[PDB]
Amino acid sequence: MLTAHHLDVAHGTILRDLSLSIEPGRVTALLGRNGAGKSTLLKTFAGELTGSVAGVRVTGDVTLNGEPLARIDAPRLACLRAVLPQAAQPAFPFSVDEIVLLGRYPHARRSGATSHRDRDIAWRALERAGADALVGRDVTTLSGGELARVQFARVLAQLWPDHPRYLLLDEPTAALDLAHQHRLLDTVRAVAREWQLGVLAIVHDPNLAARHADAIAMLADGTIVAHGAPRDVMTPAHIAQCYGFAVKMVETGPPVMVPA
Amino acid sequence: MLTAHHLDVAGTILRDLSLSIEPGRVTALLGRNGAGKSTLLKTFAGELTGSVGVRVTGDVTLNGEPLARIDAPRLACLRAVLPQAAQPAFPFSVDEIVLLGRYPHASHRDRDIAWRALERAGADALVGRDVTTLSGGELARVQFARVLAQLWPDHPRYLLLDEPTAALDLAHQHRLLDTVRAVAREWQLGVLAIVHDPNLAARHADAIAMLADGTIVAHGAPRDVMTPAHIAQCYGFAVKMVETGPPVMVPA
Amino acid sequence: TSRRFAPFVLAALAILMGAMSVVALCVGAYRIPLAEAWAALSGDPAAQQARAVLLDIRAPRVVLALLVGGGFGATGAAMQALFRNPLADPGLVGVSSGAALGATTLIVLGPASAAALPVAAFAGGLAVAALVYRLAASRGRLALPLLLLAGIAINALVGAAIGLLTFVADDAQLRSLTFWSLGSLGGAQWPTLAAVAPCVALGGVLLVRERDALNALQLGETEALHLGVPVQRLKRRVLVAVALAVGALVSCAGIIGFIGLVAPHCVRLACGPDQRIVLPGAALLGALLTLAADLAARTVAAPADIPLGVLTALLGAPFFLALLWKNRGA
Amino acid sequence: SRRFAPFVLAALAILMGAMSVVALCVGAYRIPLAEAWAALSGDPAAQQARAVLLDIRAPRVVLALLVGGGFGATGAAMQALFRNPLADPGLVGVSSGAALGATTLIVLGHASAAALPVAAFAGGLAVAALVYRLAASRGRLALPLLLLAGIAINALVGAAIGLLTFVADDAQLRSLTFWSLGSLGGAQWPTLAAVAPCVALGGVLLVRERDALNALQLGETEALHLGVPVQRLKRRVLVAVALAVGALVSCAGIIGFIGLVAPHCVRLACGPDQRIVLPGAALLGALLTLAADLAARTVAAPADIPLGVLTALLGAPFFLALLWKNRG
Ligand SMILES: CCCCCCCCCCO[C@@H]1O[C@H](CO)[C@@H](O[C@H]2O[C@H](CO)[C@@H](O)[C@H](O)[C@H]2O)[C@H](O)[C@H]1O
Ligand SMILES: CCCCCCCCCCO[C@@H]1O[C@H](CO)[C@@H](O[C@H]2O[C@H](CO)[C@@H](O)[C@H](O)[C@H]2O)[C@H](O)[C@H]1O
């Protein structure tokens, strides 16, 4: 598993005694108000804060399938985890084909082999991202929604099964329209179940985390203040201290958070 | 009454669009990305009809007279725009920003208003702070206080929100939308706001207009408009509605 | 809604500048104490030659240093507001290049009236500052990115003409070009200041008449438009005012040199971005810094008279080294 | 998949070669092609035409190819490393260093005559290295801080250059002024015996980084997640650039828009993939410079126009063009 045990990250401490584990096959959604430290915790699971990169000091164990992250080379690490970020407007007008292929960079053997399996994976990843209509296109004529499908294609390409890995979503779901957001978190869950992949996704709408996550970690002031299935964690008292927001729950035919 | 009748904008991104913002009431505008929400808002603001390369046709009127015929600096005293809090190029104090709300009016009753604007927006602890030490939530609150400073009454004006709820937290985007209505009502003031979360508009609008491919496809109170088939042809998204005792939208 | 207790900062600089200014007259190549120099300028029949060295050789140079510093300080404050960016230099308008084109066109194509050189630099300064504006504006919307792109392109073409003209220049012409291009207040005489000063003051007036609109524009261009600021008319009025003051100054000082970046940046860090403080604030501090720089040249290596551009670069370098050290981490 | 441009590369090649021949058969010392072929063939009647072709005219052609090729490829690399088309090989401060190296030699002293490129070369690299050290923090290099360190050191450098120009005499002024204007009139074989391997090496380090460069143009954080040593690569690209551009400007003076223009054309022609753009740029760079330097030798002969002048008369319509391009 991908695991933080008694994690501290530090300018004071932004993460204080934090313990969370990402389970292969299951999707863990990360909730918290702005500044709660969600994006730090995720950078920490990426390994941006531990190794020959930083002055910020980190304490406690963080573990990927059994070894401390700090002992995992950025090249090797690029094969066990991938990060789907956000503000994807590229600096130069690459093609879609090129963006996705770049996800095969940590695998390309010579240095940038672009082998035939790689062009297939790139096509099959564009397939599951639902972006295969966009083969050819200049990435700068793409709506933010199309581009967001392409970046998802590219991050799948990097994790494609070959010869347990981890996918870290950094608020991928916002600025997608409604139907789009549910589409992506459904596919993410499917991939996580099919490839035995551990997913941590930072999500804004707690109702959205409720429908698509197997597990929820509510992060309040550098610490995880609730963890577990959407049924048990999603409660008025928890939403209360995580968000300062007085809510109530309501049923359907997964239960929805509602104000007042 | 701030009204658009048979309004076209140019390809063409708004096709034959009729809608009216009316004082005391908050209309919320819903649509998916690329539906022309932001174009229509700029149109009401008077950005595409004064003197400033695109084609606009139809009547857009503010309290009777056509927008095409209202100076920018007088227009600035009839409407204001909440643009979602950006941190300026240089480190002004919170006071200097709010007082800038008073620029179309400019002093002495100014400093008094800027205070009472800062208070209604719940951003008065922030006085004398540098805006670049502010979190985006405080920054949002201060920008809100600047727009209230601009529309403040003394001796029917309009407030347009270009997605100010954006990435405020859950509890603060609710406060802001509530306090807009509260001010819309007291100062008798027409509010048009682009909202992302359809349930957020349900809970705080008086009227919901849905935008689908350049044109309006529904208009009325949340109760009558928030239907699965409207959400379908607006968002291409299959939902159902659940009660509460404000009925909330849910997929499946 | 309080304030920041600036105006003493403004007052101090005015005093410090004024003081320094007075001492500047006594420490040039002609050394004279405050007493004897007062007496001479006040009509003492015993010091008719001393009045002539001070009122004819020293004064125009000290006054030119105040016009240059105050000029660059104020136009920089305006441009940095206009571009919402502390790195906008007054040069970018186009005007510096045209000065250097017109100055070199005249030095090298002789076929000399001492009013011929500044008038040429001033015409070229405004012409290429006006040509760059037309290339960027579309009758009539002025995108600041396009103004910068026209500038890059028109600057490439003017440097082509300059090097071509340099290439063909004989020894005397080359010596003017490089001297003028290192910046010097050593050409300062009253008849030209009669012409330069009203330009700089009229540019100065036009900027002041825009201190509120510029403050509103610091909020966002679209934000300011919503407040009623006519941001397109505002862009053009600042540029023509900057072009008019800088063009007058480069015409008789040459290329200098970092003040319009440094001065409005310290005044800002002391009093905030409020255009109502910064524009007179930066001009006082600019006049104070330029004069400190010219007092330094006429002194540190006496009797050599070191190019002023060299000394103002020795302010720029520590200023940007301070910026660097400050914005580590960030 | 959607991008077959190796014909673009191959075309640029043919056009470059073609231009090379055309440059060898023109023009100041009047040689008709018949005397040109006889001279190259060993006919003793064409003995002087041969010395011109091989000792005067060949070194300038090969130098123009080295200059244009070196600036195109390092433009290609700088713009990928900074993910901005406007990044220019000079930002390291190599160009000022060379100016300061060369102008302290012209104005003080001493030795001769291949001493001018060595001073210019040691000056570039030293100012390059200083600008690097001021920005890095042992060991993380932010590219904003690189620029500030550059602005600052170029301030300091420019003053030292201003002070030398000031105390210089009329002969020494004639030398700076023209040294900084650009020229290939110097070119002889022993010169570019040294320069060529210097820029031959730089180009090898850059091609050796092309795949990491492509990942980088996707995101500094994105490249980092794919396994690129983003810190080690910035330092690697910067050295290689400071190295070929240093050797180049040390014996050509300051030129002059090519490192911007050629990569931007191949990027418009073939997209941004570093695997095509660096050879493409190096190729089109060498082609545009030869063409420029040919015009300088012959447009006003026997005047030898500084080539800084001509390569600016190239950047002017280019920037004027992509103005006109991006009005929207
Ligand atoms: C805030 C920005 C505004 C700052 C204004 C700058 C102040 C500069 C004033 C320029 O006015 C000049 O004053 C000189 C005073 O000496 C006059 O010379 C006069 O005195 C000279 C000294 O001998 C004589 O040579 C001249 O004939 C005689 O005109 C000169 O004509 C006049 O134009
Ligand atoms: C990837 C880079 C590809 C670009 C190719 C450029 C490579 C240039 C390397 C320079 O090599 C030179 O070749 C000359 C050949 O002529 C030699 O001159 C020799 O021949 C000359 C005339 O032919 C004589 O004048 C000289 O004395 C004699 O050294 C010279 O020594 C040698 O250093």
Side-chain angles (χ1 to χ4, degrees):
Chain A
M1 308 205 158
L2 190 49
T3 295
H5 192 210
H6 305 332
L7 185 67
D8 273 86
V9 189
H11 275 41
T13 90
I14 172 96
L15 284 200
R16 216 205 69 268
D17 193 289
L18 184 145
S19 289
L20 175 63
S21 5
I22 303 161
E23 301 182 333
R26 291 262 167 288
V27 162
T28 293
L30 191 63
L31 306 187
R33 2 160 63 235
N34 309 330
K38 296 185 296 301
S39 173
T40 290
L41 188 266
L42 188 139
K43 287 195 162 185
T44 300
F45 281 122
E48 298 167 36
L49 307 179
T50 183
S52 81
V53 171
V56 284
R57 311 172 82 169
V58 57
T59 69
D61 318 86
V62 56
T63 275
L64 197 156
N65 294 332
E67 66 187 326
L69 262 200
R71 215 209 117 244
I72 301 193
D73 294 348
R76 229 171 87 243
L77 193 56
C79 288
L80 314 158
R81 66 104 185 71
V83 189
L84 171 57
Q86 36 247 112
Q89 70 166 66
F92 293 98
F94 277 97
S95 68
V96 169
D97 325 20
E98 294 167 331
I99 304 294
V100 174
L101 278 163
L102 271 159
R104 296 301 304 162
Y105 182 94
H107 306 288
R109 226 283 156 178
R110 165 220 174 106
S111 165
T114 317
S115 65
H116 326 84
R117 274 209 80 252
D118 290 335
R119 311 214 287 112
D120 198 85
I121 290 161
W123 164 258
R124 302 298 177 181
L126 275 165
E127 181 112 2
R128 221 160 327 305
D132 53 307
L134 309 187
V135 175
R137 300 268 310 263
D138 184 331
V139 284
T140 56
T141 74
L142 298 179
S143 55
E146 283 160 338
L147 183 68
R149 297 196 301 268
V150 174
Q151 295 297 6
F152 187 42
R154 171 197 130 230
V155 54
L156 296 168
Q158 169 178 12
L159 296 177
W160 210 264
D162 208 28
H163 54 283
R165 295 126 187 254
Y166 298 94
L167 167 59
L168 307 178
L169 305 183
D170 192 322
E171 236 169 9
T173 189
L176 279 43
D177 345 36
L178 291 174
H180 191 348
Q181 333 187 292
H182 291 284
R183 269 194 288 104
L184 170 54
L185 299 184
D186 261 312
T187 310
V188 162
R189 195 167 186 173
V191 161
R193 286 207 227 89
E194 291 171 27
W195 310 351
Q196 205 71 355
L197 193 124
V199 177
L200 175 67
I202 299 166
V203 185
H204 60 301
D205 191 12
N207 282 333
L208 190 61
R211 282 170 289 257
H212 306 268
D214 312 306
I216 290 198
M218 325 206 51
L219 189 86
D221 227 26
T223 308
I224 290 176
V225 69
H227 187 12
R231 274 276 189 198
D232 343 303
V233 180
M234 206 93 49
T235 61
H238 279 154
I239 296 308
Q241 46 170 326
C242 183
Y243 287 101
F245 182 39
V247 306
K248 66 163 166 286
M249 296 303 155
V250 168
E251 290 283 333
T252 64
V256 278
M257 172 194 325
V258 150
Chain B
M1 197 122 100
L2 173 50
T3 299
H5 251 80
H6 316 267
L7 185 101
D8 263 271
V9 188
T12 71
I13 184 94
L14 296 179
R15 296 171 204 84
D16 179 37
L17 201 156
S18 322
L19 172 80
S20 306
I21 317 158
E22 40 183 46
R25 287 191 120 226
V26 172
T27 302
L29 165 66
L30 266 42
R32 45 169 165 88
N33 297 334
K37 281 175 287 161
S38 172
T39 294
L40 172 66
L41 197 101
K42 303 195 131 189
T43 301
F44 279 123
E47 303 188 39
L48 331 169
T49 32
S51 278
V52 52
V54 298
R55 316 124 181 179
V56 177
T57 77
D59 335 349
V60 52
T61 47
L62 190 168
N63 295 344
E65 74 171 302
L67 265 188
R69 206 204 170 274
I70 310 185
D71 293 341
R74 165 162 137 265
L75 188 53
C77 296
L78 308 162
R79 50 102 257 227
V81 189
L82 246 191
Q84 183 202 316
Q87 225 147 239
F90 303 86
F92 294 90
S93 75
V94 166
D95 342 27
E96 278 149 348
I97 289 191
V98 187
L99 286 161
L100 277 179
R102 302 297 301 167
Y103 172 96
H105 308 302
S107 287
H108 302 139
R109 210 164 284 187
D110 274 19
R111 303 170 99 78
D112 166 47
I113 282 191
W115 181 251
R116 280 190 255 261
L118 214 61
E119 84 178 356
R120 300 273 200 112
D124 35 68
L126 315 174
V127 186
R129 266 233 237 172
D130 175 341
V131 305
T132 51
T133 80
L134 297 175
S135 76
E138 298 158 336
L139 184 57
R141 250 135 54 212
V142 167
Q143 282 308 348
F144 186 26
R146 173 181 71 74
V147 182
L148 295 184
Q150 177 174 3
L151 290 169
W152 203 271
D154 213 274
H155 153 60
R157 301 148 306 186
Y158 302 89
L159 160 59
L160 313 178
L161 312 188
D162 194 346
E163 220 163 40
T165 49
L168 287 32
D169 337 47
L170 257 279
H172 169 16
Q173 54 188 19
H174 275 285
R175 269 184 316 122
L176 171 57
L177 286 189
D178 185 54
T179 294
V180 177
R181 211 192 199 156
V183 169
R185 286 160 165 178
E186 173 175 6
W187 298 355
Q188 306 157 270
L189 177 134
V191 175
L192 173 64
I194 307 159
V195 181
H196 63 290
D197 183 318
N199 292 318
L200 198 46
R203 193 182 168 83
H204 300 279
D206 300 318
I208 297 192
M210 287 181 194
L211 214 62
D213 207 62
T215 170
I216 217 103
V217 296
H219 194 13
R223 292 274 180 177
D224 315 306
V225 193
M226 212 78 63
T227 81
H230 281 162
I231 300 287
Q233 70 167 307
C234 176
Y235 294 120
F237 182 27
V239 302
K240 71 183 163 72
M241 308 295 316
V242 172
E243 312 278 356
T244 289
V248 291
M249 184 191 69
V250 159
Chain C
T1 66
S2 166
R3 256 216 231 237
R4 47 234 312 193
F5 75 162
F8 300 95
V9 175
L10 275 202
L13 294 167
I15 307 316
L16 247 200
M17 173 209 79
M20 163 134 294
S21 205
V22 158
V23 1
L25 290 155
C26 308
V27 285
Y30 177 82
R31 311 317 188 116
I32 180 155
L34 298 177
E36 310 210 15
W38 187 260
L41 277 189
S42 349
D44 181 354
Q48 291 167 332
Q49 165 166 316
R51 178 164 192 283
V53 166
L54 294 186
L55 205 109
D56 281 352
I57 322 294
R58 228 322 211 238
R61 173 148 173 179
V62 169
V63 139
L64 186 66
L66 294 176
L67 285 188
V68 157
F72 277 120
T75 48
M79 292 266 301
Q80 284 148 56
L82 180 76
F83 287 91
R84 265 155 299 121
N85 178 12
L87 282 181
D89 189 276
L92 305 184
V93 182
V95 59
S96 308
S97 310
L101 184 55
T104 301
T105 298
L106 177 66
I107 297 184
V108 176
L109 305 174
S113 318
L117 189 39
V119 171
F122 192 64
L126 296 175
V128 324
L131 163 58
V132 171
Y133 181 84
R134 246 294 284 273
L135 288 187
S138 44
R139 293 180 179 179
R141 279 170 286 185
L142 181 56
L144 300 194
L146 297 187
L147 185 136
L148 289 181
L149 234 47
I152 307 317
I154 293 288
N155 267 345
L157 173 72
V158 175
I162 288 190
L164 207 48
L165 278 164
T166 306
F167 168 65
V168 79
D170 63 35
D171 282 301
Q173 307 164 316
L174 195 63
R175 181 150 280 271
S176 292
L177 296 183
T178 83
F179 152 84
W180 183 93
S181 86
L182 300 175
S184 174
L185 306 171
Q189 58 197 233
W190 290 119
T192 61
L193 286 169
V196 172
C199 283
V200 180
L202 172 79
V205 154
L206 298 178
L207 292 182
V208 178
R209 274 52 186 169
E210 301 291 333
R211 57 201 182 169
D212 292 319
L214 284 167
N215 272 342
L217 180 61
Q218 294 317 298
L219 215 135
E221 168 164 332
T222 285
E223 277 91 3
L225 177 166
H226 285 155
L227 285 168
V229 175
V231 352
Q232 296 301 323
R233 303 279 297 162
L234 170 59
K235 296 185 165 188
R236 168 177 209 175
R237 275 186 294 209
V238 178
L239 294 182
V240 56
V242 166
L244 175 63
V246 176
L249 287 167
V250 194
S251 278
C252 57
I255 305 285
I256 311 129
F258 290 90
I259 274 74
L261 248 61
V262 170
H265 195 80
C266 314
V267 166
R268 263 197 305 261
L269 291 151
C271 320
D274 184 340
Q275 195 59 11
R276 258 139 66 241
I277 298 156
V278 165
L279 188 132
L284 295 182
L285 181 64
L288 184 58
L289 291 159
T290 305
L291 181 65
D294 192 65
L295 224 139
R298 252 256 149 269
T299 285
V300 74
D305 194 11
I306 299 176
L308 191 55
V310 145
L311 263 299
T312 61
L314 298 169
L315 281 158
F319 173 79
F320 274 84
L321 239 46
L323 276 217
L324 196 63
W325 189 92
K326 187 182 183 255
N327 298 301
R328 282 208 162 183
Chain D
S1 253
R2 191 239 186 200
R3 210 139 235 188
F4 243 50
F7 305 107
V8 164
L9 277 206
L12 288 167
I14 320 298
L15 260 207
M16 180 191 52
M19 178 68 64
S20 281
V21 181
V22 182
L24 276 192
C25 303
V26 296
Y29 190 103
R30 292 142 222 307
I31 304 169
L33 308 155
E35 189 159 3
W37 189 263
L40 290 185
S41 322
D43 191 349
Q47 240 178 287
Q48 282 161 108
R50 179 224 180 70
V52 169
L53 286 182
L54 297 199
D55 302 332
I56 298 179
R57 195 180 281 170
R60 198 188 168 119
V61 162
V62 69
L63 182 69
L65 296 174
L66 282 179
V67 153
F71 284 154
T74 63
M78 289 303 285
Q79 305 151 9
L81 183 94
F82 280 90
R83 34 220 168 276
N84 190 304
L86 286 166
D88 179 280
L91 294 183
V92 201
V94 208
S95 220
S96 343
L100 181 69
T103 179
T104 63
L105 174 71
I106 300 195
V107 163
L108 309 188
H110 211 106
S112 217
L116 202 40
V118 173
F121 190 70
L125 275 48
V127 172
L130 174 74
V131 173
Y132 182 85
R133 183 179 86 252
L134 282 182
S137 60
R138 292 172 172 172
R140 298 169 289 173
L141 173 68
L143 301 172
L145 280 64
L146 185 70
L147 301 189
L148 289 190
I151 296 153
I153 292 315
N154 289 331
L156 203 65
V157 167
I161 284 167
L163 233 122
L164 306 165
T165 299
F166 166 69
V167 306
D169 73 12
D170 281 338
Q172 310 178 289
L173 209 66
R174 171 84 49 215
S175 277
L176 335 170
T177 287
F178 293 170
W179 183 95
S180 71
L181 284 181
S183 178
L184 312 187
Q188 27 206 15
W189 291 113
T191 312
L192 55 90
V195 158
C198 258
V199 1
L201 168 69
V204 165
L205 307 182
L206 290 179
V207 57
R208 263 46 171 186
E209 303 285 316
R210 62 209 164 160
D211 296 313
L213 275 170
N214 279 326
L216 194 51
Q217 307 173 277
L218 199 135
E220 200 147 324
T221 294
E222 287 87 351
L224 215 121
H225 291 146
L226 294 160
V228 188
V230 158
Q231 257 46 264
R232 177 134 182 90
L233 163 82
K234 287 150 151 146
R235 181 190 336 129
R236 215 136 238 285
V237 169
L238 243 38
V239 156
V241 168
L243 198 62
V245 171
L248 286 187
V249 66
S250 78
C251 64
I254 310 294
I255 331 139
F257 293 85
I258 292 102
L260 263 45
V261 167
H264 194 67
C265 297
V266 329
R267 249 199 319 272
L268 258 58
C270 312
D273 181 351
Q274 195 67 6
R275 272 147 58 238
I276 289 114
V277 167
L278 180 161
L283 225 48
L284 171 66
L287 174 55
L288 285 170
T289 293
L290 197 63
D293 180 75
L294 185 85
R297 277 150 50 197
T298 61
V299 78
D304 213 352
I305 316 298
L307 109 155
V309 168
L310 271 79
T311 66
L313 297 177
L314 233 152
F318 165 77
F319 268 93
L320 210 176
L322 56 59
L323 195 177
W324 182 240
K325 180 134 82 70
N326 288 285
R327 260 210 197 282

